[PDB]
Design an enzyme around this catalytic site. Structure first.
Site, PDB file in Angstrom:
ATOM      1  N   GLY A  95      26.382  43.444  52.838  1.00  0.00           N
ATOM      2  CA  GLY A  95      27.293  42.628  52.724  1.00  0.00           C
ATOM      3  C   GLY A  95      28.758  42.790  53.265  1.00  0.00           C
ATOM      4  O   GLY A  95      28.978  43.218  54.157  1.00  0.00           O
ATOM      5  N   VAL A 124      32.201  32.997  49.139  1.00  0.00           N
ATOM      6  CA  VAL A 124      31.421  34.039  50.045  1.00  0.00           C
ATOM      7  C   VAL A 124      29.980  33.835  50.497  1.00  0.00           C
ATOM      8  O   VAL A 124      29.208  33.845  49.246  1.00  0.00           O
ATOM      9  CB  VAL A 124      32.393  35.208  50.800  1.00  0.00           C
ATOM     10  CG1 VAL A 124      31.855  36.195  51.633  1.00  0.00           C
ATOM     11  CG2 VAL A 124      34.023  34.684  50.653  1.00  0.00           C
ATOM     12  N   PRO A 134      39.274  36.859  48.563  1.00  0.00           N
ATOM     13  CA  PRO A 134      38.380  36.336  49.527  1.00  0.00           C
ATOM     14  C   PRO A 134      38.390  34.270  48.452  1.00  0.00           C
ATOM     15  O   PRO A 134      38.721  34.946  47.224  1.00  0.00           O
ATOM     16  CB  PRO A 134      37.255  36.193  49.269  1.00  0.00           C
ATOM     17  CG  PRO A 134      36.765  38.055  49.458  1.00  0.00           C
ATOM     18  CD  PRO A 134      38.482  38.283  49.089  1.00  0.00           C
ATOM     19  N   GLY A 135      37.593  33.232  48.784  1.00  0.00           N
ATOM     20  CA  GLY A 135      37.258  32.292  48.138  1.00  0.00           C
ATOM     21  C   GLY A 135      36.214  32.396  47.968  1.00  0.00           C
ATOM     22  O   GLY A 135      35.858  33.329  47.303  1.00  0.00           O
ATOM     23  N   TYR A 162      33.968  38.086  35.139  1.00  0.00           N
ATOM     24  CA  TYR A 162      34.729  38.505  36.404  1.00  0.00           C
ATOM     25  C   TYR A 162      36.079  38.226  36.699  1.00  0.00           C
ATOM     26  O   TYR A 162      36.599  39.457  37.529  1.00  0.00           O
ATOM     27  CB  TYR A 162      34.014  37.681  37.121  1.00  0.00           C
ATOM     28  CG  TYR A 162      33.797  37.433  38.807  1.00  0.00           C
ATOM     29  CD1 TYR A 162      32.767  38.884  39.379  1.00  0.00           C
ATOM     30  CD2 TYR A 162      34.496  37.124  39.347  1.00  0.00           C
ATOM     31  CE1 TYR A 162      33.727  39.096  41.147  1.00  0.00           C
ATOM     32  CE2 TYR A 162      34.477  37.257  40.889  1.00  0.00           C
ATOM     33  CZ  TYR A 162      34.197  37.840  41.510  1.00  0.00           C
ATOM     34  OH  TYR A 162      34.638  38.472  43.545  1.00  0.00           O
ATOM     35  N   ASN A 193      36.023  48.177  47.523  1.00  0.00           N
ATOM     36  CA  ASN A 193      35.035  46.412  47.891  1.00  0.00           C
ATOM     37  C   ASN A 193      34.001  46.609  47.346  1.00  0.00           C
ATOM     38  O   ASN A 193      33.547  45.742  46.675  1.00  0.00           O
ATOM     39  CB  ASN A 193      35.165  46.523  49.326  1.00  0.00           C
ATOM     40  CG  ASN A 193      33.630  46.011  49.394  1.00  0.00           C
ATOM     41  OD1 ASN A 193      33.518  44.245  49.647  1.00  0.00           O
ATOM     42  ND2 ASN A 193      32.115  46.326  49.701  1.00  0.00           N
TER      43      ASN A 193
END
Lengths: 256, 239, 250, 242
Positions: C16, C185, C182-183, C152, C86
């Site tokens: 990813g 993905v 990020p939006g 989340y 990450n």
């Protein structure tokens, strides 16, 4: 050469942050139109940057001067890839003492001037159909009000809002609108701010400056070259997925 | 009866949110000056609500109208405890089509008008030395921009900002400056009913969803609340 | 070559976005330690990236594995300049249906794992005295709650918070802590089912609503991941930067 | 009497803000369960408050103790209209010194306990079908990080996030979920004076007391706030802006 073959217009580019953005953009292979109300000052700046720079006299508070300035830049370059909205005035005063004159003059430059310059770039970039980049200069002052700085803070809050609005409206034409929010910037920028705080506190000649600097988590006031990397990045394809954002480059003076 | 012995000036008070706040403040035992550009459009409400209500002709876009209206309210009531900055105009247009005329007229009411009315209320409340309350009408629109509402969003972001700056500057005089941020308010057609249906609460906002907060922020139970903007929007925004 | 002679450790890097960060960093001249819980996946990822990559098996939910992994990378490289936090799990459930099992496993990776890896990086960077870079993967989910993603969203809100605290705490050692948000993905099925959708139908609706006009790919994010690890970002402290096609505004 | 006939449960209610909320909710006509890990401390509070109050022993870090504590309150009152998630621990240390022991114990009360108590309230309120009110206690610390407070800040930012998620999810069931964010309230190693430095530095002029917050705690539990959904309200003397 991250801006090779690109054309930019920077407002208030005769001195300080705007001059530094013009320099960095030329170093990255851009052609740069430097706009300022003072024709002599912007001629001098162009003379310091060399033949990749051109001077435009523009009063961002007047629609006819905006249209003429853009007409001149498009006439010279053929097209405009990048607008940096950098022209700004500072004022300070408790809300109960703010005059219509200070209000009008700071709003006309910081908010209205930024809006209608953004509109002029946007119309040109829509018509051309090849996208573009618009970068508004906001401020930590745009993120939260403070006592004494109601007019300036409100003008920069509106710049952040119009960055967002224009960002969502223009991305379908390949136009990326974003903003940079500097913190407290040293030298000539600080001195503008300091001169408007004389009448209120003026706590001891020049102690205020090291206190504010000491209080920046990074450990000093900003220099123009702290901002140039972000100014270049936002005008590159590595930022094409960045839309309507305001990026704090402020040494931790604000968190967003 | 939570505003007994209080005096209030509400701008844009002829209809909608302003009228609903005037009725509510009268019911809580306040004296209320209902201010609007058209005094006749307010004489009807002043008529029904009875002698605790007075009509004031005030155009918030003109300094001389602001001065004349505040001197009139302070002259009639002797003092002003509460300002509600409710006068507002809407416009929509993509950024590329925004006219100087629309920009100027929406900025003149929403931002400049609010700002100079807040200043007039402050000069009086500072002089008098008993504190006071200023409640500005922001919006979800002032929290984040959106594609066709650039002028309106920016004017309301300026309202949020000046509420913060004035809040911090004025609290040492016992003046509480706060803001209420409505969501979408009952004010082809596919859009208003798509947006209305999408409010998590289940319907578009009405003026009376806001009156609770409009009373609360004018009481002593809110004395430690300074420079805040409170979303009353059915979940349509989060702050 | 914006990262020439730099050393990085990327968690969740076997696949990813983490893998694409590792690849972009190697293209800018970095040496990269790929850390992941799965030893075969991470050996396969290092074979794919070539000899500027090294494999470290690391479970970010355990202190013993964190300490061993950082010590090993510092031993192999001599120093660590950049941590990319990450490693992340996704879950969805309305608040009234959330299990302890789901809550515990997502919080352990996204919040606790991120926090104790950032602290392992900080301890080394403080000791060496040459500063460093920590980039936390936050999300639009961390900026605002939503009805089906309470666990989340909360975990990524905690990531933004700890980026700010650690940012302000560490900058006097020349350590820059910042975050990328990020939006959307390009788990799915279970998520789509809450609205009575197939994941296919869901992704299309979510894609179309992104102002930019599509869901994100890893390469939208690589520019910011490099930028925040360079001297051009030295005055950037405790910030979270939305790379999200306009899907959120900050 | 703005809460006549309503039932409330307040976690960490033996002392400080929770006790003052209990006192103010009783003064407004509410029946209040005061829940705390310390059974004896909350039995003494119930004694001073009178028989509108009932004592419940609850350790918000344990699922079994949450289920037993909610069962007792629903047993005793028949229904629960209002939950106040007030139980909280504080810790401070620079990020490089934070221990797993301090991290786990502050996260367990502030984030995990508040989450699973809010879930217990929601499940009852959904089953009963008459709506309800959940008020989480956040902090200015949950709005932005600061150097020595990483664990506490992150705990309170998670509280704000779950308030928003829960608020959007539960309003379809007539459940209003909102939060209050105090500033510095009344209420060492790494540095008389230090306390009225922070105090004097509050724009209002002083540190907060419990009674600054009770107005908002009452308001968010009433129909005058029914359109208020997923919000965090700063009651902080201007020490933060939101």
């Amino acid at each position: 050469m991250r801006l090779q073959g690109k054309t930019a217009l920077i407002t208030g580019a005769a001195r300080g942050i705007g001059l530094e953005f013009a320099r960095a953009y030329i170093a990255e292979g851009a052609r740069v139109a430097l706009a300022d109300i003072n024709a002599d000052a912007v001629r001098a700046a162009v003379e310091s940057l060399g033949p990749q720079a051109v001077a435009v006299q523009m009063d961002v508070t007047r629609q006819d001067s905006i249209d003429a300035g853009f007409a001149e830049v498009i006439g010279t370059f053929g097209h405009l890839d990048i607008l940096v909205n950098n022209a700004a005035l500072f004022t300070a005063a408790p809300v109960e003492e703010v005059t219509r004159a200070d209000y009008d003059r700071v709003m006309a430059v910081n908010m209205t001037g930024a809006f209608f310059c953004m509109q002029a770039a946007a119309k040109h970039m829509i018509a051309r159909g090849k996208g573009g980049k618009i970068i508004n200069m906001a401020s930590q002052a745009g993120r939260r009000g403070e006592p004494l700085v109601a007019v300036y803070c409100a003008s920069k809050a509106a710049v952040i809002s119009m960055t967002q609005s224009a960002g969502l409206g223009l991305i379908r034409h390949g136009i990326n609108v974003n903003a940079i929010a500097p913190g407290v910037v040293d030298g000539e920028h600080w001195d503008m701010v300091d001169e408007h705080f004389a009448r209120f506190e003026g706590l001891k000649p020049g102690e205020k400056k090291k206190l504010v600097g000491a209080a920046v988590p990074f450990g000093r006031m900003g220099v123009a070259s702290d901002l140039t990397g972000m100014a270049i990045f936002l005008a590159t394809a590595e930022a094409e997925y960045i839309v309507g954002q305001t990026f704090g480059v402020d040494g931790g003076n604000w968190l967003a």
